[PDB]
Amino acid sequence: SGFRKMAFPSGKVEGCMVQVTCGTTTLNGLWLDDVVYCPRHVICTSEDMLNPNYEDLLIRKSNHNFLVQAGNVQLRVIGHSMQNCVLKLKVDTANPKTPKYKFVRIQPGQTFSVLACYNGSPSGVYQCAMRPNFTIKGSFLNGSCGSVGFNIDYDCVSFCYMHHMELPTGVHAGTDLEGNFYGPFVDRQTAQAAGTDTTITVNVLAWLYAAVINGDRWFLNRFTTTLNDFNLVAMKYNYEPLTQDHVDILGPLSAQTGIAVLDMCASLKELLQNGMNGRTILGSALLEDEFTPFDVVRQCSG
Amino acid sequence: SGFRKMAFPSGKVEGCMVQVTCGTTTLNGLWLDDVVYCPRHVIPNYEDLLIRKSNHNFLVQAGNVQLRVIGHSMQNCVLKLKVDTANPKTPKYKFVRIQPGQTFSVLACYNGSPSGVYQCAMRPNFTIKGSFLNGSCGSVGFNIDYDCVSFCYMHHMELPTGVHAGTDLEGNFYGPFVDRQTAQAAGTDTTITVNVLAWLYAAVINGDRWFLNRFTTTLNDFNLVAMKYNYEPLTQDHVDILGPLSAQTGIAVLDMCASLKELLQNGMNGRTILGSALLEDEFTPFDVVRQCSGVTF
Ligand SMILES: CO[C@@]1(C(=O)Nc2cncc3cc(F)ccc23)CCOc2ccc(Cl)cc21
Numbered sequence: 397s398g399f400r401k402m403a404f405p406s407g408k409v410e411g412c413m414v415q416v417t418c419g420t421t422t423l424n425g426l427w428l429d430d431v432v433y434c435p436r437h438v439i440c441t442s443e444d445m446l447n448p449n450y451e452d453l454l455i456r457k458s459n460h461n462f463l464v465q466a467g468n469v470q471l472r473v474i475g476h477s478m479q480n481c482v483l484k485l486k487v488d489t490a491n492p493k494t495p496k497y498k499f500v501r502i503q504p505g506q507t508f509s510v511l512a513c514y515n516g517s518p519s520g521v522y523q524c525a526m527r528p529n530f531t532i533k534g535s536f537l538n539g540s541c542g543s544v545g546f547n548i549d550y551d552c553v554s555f556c557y558m559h560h561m562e563l564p565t566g567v568h569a570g571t572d573l574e575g576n577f578y579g580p581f582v583d584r585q586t587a588q589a590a591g592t593d594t595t596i597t598v599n600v601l602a603w604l605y606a607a608v609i610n611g612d613r614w615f616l617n618r619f620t621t622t623l624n625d626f627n628l629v630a631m632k633y634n635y636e637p638l639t640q641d642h643v644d645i646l647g648p649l650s651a652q653t654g655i656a657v658l659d660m661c662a663s664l665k666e667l668l669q670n671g672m673n674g675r676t677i678l679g680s681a682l683l684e685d686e687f688t689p690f691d692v693v694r695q696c697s698g
Numbered sequence: 699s700g701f702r703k704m705a706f707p708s709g710k711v712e713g714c715m716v717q718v719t720c721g722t723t724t725l726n727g728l729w730l731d732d733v734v735y736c737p738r739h740v741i742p743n744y745e746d747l748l749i750r751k752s753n754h755n756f757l758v759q760a761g762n763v764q765l766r767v768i769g770h771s772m773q774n775c776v777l778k779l780k781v782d783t784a785n786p787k788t789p790k791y792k793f794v795r796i797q798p799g800q801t802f803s804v805l806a807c808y809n810g811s812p813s814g815v816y817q818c819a820m821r822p823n824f825t826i827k828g829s830f831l832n833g834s835c836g837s838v839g840f841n842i843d844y845d846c847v848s849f850c851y852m853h854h855m856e857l858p859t860g861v862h863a864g865t866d867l868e869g870n871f872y873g874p875f876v877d878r879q880t881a882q883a884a885g886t887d888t889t890i891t892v893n894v895l896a897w898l899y900a901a902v903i904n905g906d907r908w909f910l911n912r913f914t915t916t917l918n919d920f921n922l923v924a925m926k927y928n929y930e931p932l933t934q935d936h937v938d939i940l941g942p943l944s945a946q947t948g949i950a951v952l953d954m955c956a957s958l959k960e961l962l963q964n965g966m967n968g969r970t971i972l973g974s975a976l977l978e979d980e981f982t983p984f985d986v987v988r989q990c991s992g993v994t995f
């Protein structure tokens with residue numbers, strides 16, 4: 397029993413964190429085999445950030461301009477190349493602690509763990525979700541750039557995020573491990589704004605099924621809804637549209653509890669209308685949206 | 699910016715998790731040097747049950763490798779299995795007993811394999827509001843200080859309300875619990891006041907000030923109010939511990955106490971603090987300073 401926001405064990409990722417220094421800039425790198433991946437803005441100055449020409453800044457650098465530190469050991473850089481917004485530094489030593497891994501690009505609504513690091517040293521781990529506006533509500537201070545997001549399935553680490561910037565509202569923007577940003581963001585100090593955020597409807601529904609699995613049913617009602625009527629009401633509260641894919645994904649949880657997706661949708665419509673009336677759902681007074689249907693099955697069923 | 703419930707990196711603890719099997723029971727063990735620590739209920743009269751057992755009755759698995767037991771002894775509610783091999787991944791460590799209100803990270807394991815990590819606080823009623831399923835027994839709680847892992851908790855049982863009970867690594871229970879199937883209940887819980895105040899300072903540091911007011915209070919008047927709302931009494935020690943956060947934000951501890959009194963008496967009025975509609979009490983003053991500054995391990 398119990399329901400917590402759980403992060404994946406960070407050990408396999410800790411053994412990959414290194415410190416990358418270029419001139420006066422120090423940030424984090426991900427050392428996998430003989431390559432160190434880090435944000436390409438490590439080559440920029442604060443002035444360069446307004447309108448950086450990364451190709452022109454990189455052509456003026458040599459291998460020995462990049463200092464890479466793994467623990468108390470200096471790695472030797474033997475090559476460098478750019479792939480979108482990530483810099484790939486070829487090193488002379490393969491990481492002996494390289495886990496089984498893959499680079500995956502996630503969609504909004506998907507969750508992942510973040511290992512927050514400063515000076516190549518991990519300081520903490522927390523669980524996140526890619527918001528519908530492509531930002532993450534993380535906890536990052538200066539020097540956390542290059543910190544990574546991941547999931548672990550079986551013995552395989554799936555890297556899905558690398559931290560690059562903090563937006564004016566306090567939210568965070570970054571790229572996949574191929575250097576493609578999530579969202580309409582650029583690694584430029586431009587007037588960039590997150591976009592109006594919405595609630596991940598499929599995740600709130602999954603969390604409502606997790607409350608029913610843990611023995612809480614006070615929010616259920618005798619009503620149903622069509623998918624269209626549910627979406628007309630959901631949009632009025634800034635909830636993401638629920639698609640037929642979302643209804644399909646909730647099938648296993650519907651079969652386990654005996655509550656049809658559209659009947660759980662009717663309960664969500666009523667919660668939006670009435671509020672909780674001093675009650676909580678799984679220790680929360682807000683409707684939780686950072687647990688996917690897959691996370692609920694993993695934490696509850698085994 | 700940002701404020702999340704952050705756990706310590708679990709790597710140093712992952713390299714110590716093993717599976718312990720005795721008869722039909724399978725649970726988790728902590729392998730440090732040549733000893734494996736696990737709940738004694740893996741085997742009531744535990745010295746009479748233990749005296750029957752031989753070393754080969756305990757099956758210990760570290761990954762896909764079997765460790766052979768060469769000795770066994772009991773320390774309170776913890777069984778210590780002497781193994782033939784010292785763990786080469788043993789970190790720098792110490793066993794520490796924590797007080798209610800203090801927080802720690804939990805590496806939840808099943809069959810000697812870690813599945814997740816989360817942060818939690820020792821409640822005033824000595825229970826933990828964790829997330830544990832069957833097979834999680836022997837999972838451990840810890841803090842990391844520099845390069846040193848301080849083990850403070852080992853999971854033993856779930857109570858009928860869904861909360862959890864366990865021991866320190868010397869086998870002494872936190873709370874009035876016993877490792878036996880009997881009618882045991884979690885006592886009436888209270889809110890950790892010093893932690894709520896620390897979380898209010900973390901909100902001010904992150905730019906949330908709507909709850910601040912021009913008023914201050916006395917420690918006595920605040921405690922008369924706090925006792926009415928099932929909040930733990932705030933001591934002079936608590937006020938002292940909140941000194942650095944008070945100096946950083948410019949808000950005196952009894953000034954922040956007056957803001958907490960208004961939130962208890964009037965609610966949030968449709969508003970939130972750090973994305974929450976409830977007053978959060980599972981962040982200590984030290985966690986707030988560590989997260990809003992940047993300490994690494
Ligand atoms: C070079 O890093 C920038 C940045 O957003 N850094 C940060 C990243 N994470 C957390 C942060 C927390 C802070 F308190 C301060 C800065 C943070 C600084 C501002 O301009 C830019 C413009 C674009 C890009 Cl892709 C990066 C940056």
Ligand SMILES: [Cl-]
Binds near residue numbers: 502503506
């Ligand atoms: Cl995805």
